[PDB]
């Protein structure tokens, strides 16, 4: 079955997530208020939401067993490229197929297609994002699998700019093996049917959502009036060629 190390890893990731993802979304009040007039009217709010989310993803990443053994540069490299992917991933917890939106406890903090479209990004990205959310949602992942996937997403040895790939790759495998064994021993069929394969497919989807996001961020942030509505962390992480 499972293992001491594996169950240990799971317990840690679950707690790490519970400490970096607030189901009350109480912090959203601190963000620049959302405006629904792209008019970019939603950019100041989502920019802060995203920046905040980057800070929480880092908080989570630091607690991933083995992530501490990577060199600062490797850590930066991994978080730099995975951030947006993990944010889309953790967002599935607030997404609902009822109205196809992210319900973050409140109406103002309820975001639908036209809300997230008012921030400089087109349907070239939003269309696939929602599809992703629905497909992911349809997997009904246990919270154990959800956190292991975010963790596996973060420590991917093929990230551009990686140094000690062997180590990054080594740390991931341990998470992957923990995931595959968890599914086999804790996820009952039919739900478990090719669950691993489907979860890894979502990782490929995220790479794709990432690339499209990068292309629409460049275009967006290449315009001063737009890049000045962002936050310093966002500029640092998402690159700053303004």
């Amino acid at each position: 079955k499972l293992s001491e190390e594996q169950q240990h890893i799971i317990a840690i990731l679950l707690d790490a997530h519970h400490k970096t993802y607030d189901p009350t979304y109480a912090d959203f009040r601190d963000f620049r208020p959302p405006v629904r007039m792209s008019p970019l009217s939603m950019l100041p709010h989502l920019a802060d939401l995203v920046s905040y989310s980057i800070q929480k993803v880092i908080g989570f990443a630091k607690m991933i067993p083995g992530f501490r053994d990577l060199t600062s540069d490797d850590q930066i490299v991994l978080l730099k490229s995975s951030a947006i992917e993990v944010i889309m991933l953790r967002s599935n917890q607030s997404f609902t197929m009822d109205d196809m939106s992210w319900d973050c406890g409140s109406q103002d903090y309820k975001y639908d297609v036209t809300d997230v479209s008012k921030a400089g990004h087109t349907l070239e990205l939003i269309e696939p994002l929602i599809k992703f959310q629905v497909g992911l949602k349809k997997l009904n992942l246990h919270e154990e699998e959800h956190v292991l996937l975010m963790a596996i997403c973060i420590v991917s040895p093929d990230r551009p700019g990686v140094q000690d790939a062997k180590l990054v790759e080594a740390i991931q495998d341990r998470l992957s093996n923990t995931l595959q064994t968890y599914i086999r021993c804790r996820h009952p069929p039919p739900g478990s049917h090719q669950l691993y394969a489907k979860m890894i497919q979502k990782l490929a989807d995220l790479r794709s959502l990432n690339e499209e996001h990068s292309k629409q961020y460049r275009s967006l942030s290449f315009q001063p009036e737009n890049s000045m509505k962002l936050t310093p962390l966002v500029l640092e992480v998402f690159g700053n060629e303004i």
Binding site: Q55, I58, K62, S72, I76, L79, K80, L233, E236, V237
Partner: peptide
């Protein structure tokens, strides 16, 4: 590679 804030949040 020039990421003080990321660096600061990471350590």
């Amino acid at each position: 590679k020039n990421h003080p804030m990321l660096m600061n949040l990471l350590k």
